[PDB]
């Protein structure tokens, strides 16, 4: 939820697609 | 016994503060490694459970990064300062309590 809080699961990995698939 | 029970809470608070300090140091030292997730512990729940290894959980990311790292320097620094000050306060309380317990014997 609010950034900086505690979560039990990792966030999904980040990606920066140059062009949409 | 009674002597250990009088100091158990303060000693455990000191130990948990030290462990959280180590966690903060580790996740501020890994500030450049991609794919590394920020780590920290829920201090209140940990202290209550121990007074009744160590459980740690990931931190909610602040802003996205392409590499994958999710550590925020200012947030880590504020948490570090808070934990350091609270550790110092706990040490002072323990020292004062021990000094009083020693003084009662004269």
């Amino acid at each position: 939820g609010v950034p900086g809080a505690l979560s039990n699961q990792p966030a999904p990995p980040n990606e920066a697609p140059i062009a949409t698939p | 016994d009674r002597l250990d029970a009088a100091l158990r809470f303060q000693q455990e608070a000191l130990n948990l503060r030290a462990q959280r300090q180590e966690i903060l140091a580790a996740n501020i030292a890994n500030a450049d490694t991609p794919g590394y997730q920020a780590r920290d512990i829920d201090f209140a729940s940990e202290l209550k459970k121990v007074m009744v290894a160590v459980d740690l959980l990931y931190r909610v990311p602040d802003q996205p990064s392409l590499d994958g790292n999710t550590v925020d320097m200012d947030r880590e620094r504020t948490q570090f300062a808070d934990n350091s000050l609270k550790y110092q306060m706990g040490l002072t309380v323990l020292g004062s309590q021990l000094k009083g317990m020693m003084n009662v014997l004269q």
Binding site: P3, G4, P17, I18, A19, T20 | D62, Q63, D72, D74, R75, T78, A81, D82, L85, Q88, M89, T92, V93, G95, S96, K99
Partner: protein, 130 residues
């Protein structure tokens, strides 16, 4: 609690960092075009709000796209050109972004100086507990 000062200062620092990052991204994308899936790039801003816990820290609810009209530049040689042969260049105010960066830096320094002073005071506080 005499300890929510750290929370307030940390929230202020995080908000200022977010605003500076948004400004830097806009400056980087000042003259970009045809982002992913072909939609033209649009500038974004942030909105600060206070956390009524009275007095509280600052937060940023969400990033809001600018409603200022995009620049329409006549260039039919681009496949993005519409029936009028126009391409949509992003709206970036360079002076506005420079001023925003200056303000963010100044607020960040002020908050760090407040944190320094309060940390000194709190360190001196514990000397009476013995």
């Amino acid at each position: 609690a005499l300890l929510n000062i750290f929370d307030i200062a940390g929230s202020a620092l995080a908000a200022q960092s977010k605003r500076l990052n948004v400004a830097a991204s806009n400056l980087a994308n000042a003259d970009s075009v045809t982002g992913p899936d072909g939609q033209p790039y649009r500038a974004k801003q942030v909105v600060f709000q206070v956390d009524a816990a009275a007095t509280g820290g600052v937060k940023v609810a969400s990033v809001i796209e600018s409603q200022a009209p995009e620049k329409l530049v006549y260039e039919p040689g681009n496949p993005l050109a519409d029936a009028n042969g126009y391409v949509k260049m992003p709206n970036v105010d360079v002076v506005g972004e420079m001023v925003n960066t200056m303000s963010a830096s100044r607020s960040y320094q002020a908050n760090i100086e407040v944190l320094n002073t309060v940390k000194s005071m709190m360190l001196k506080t514990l000397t009476l507990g013995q």
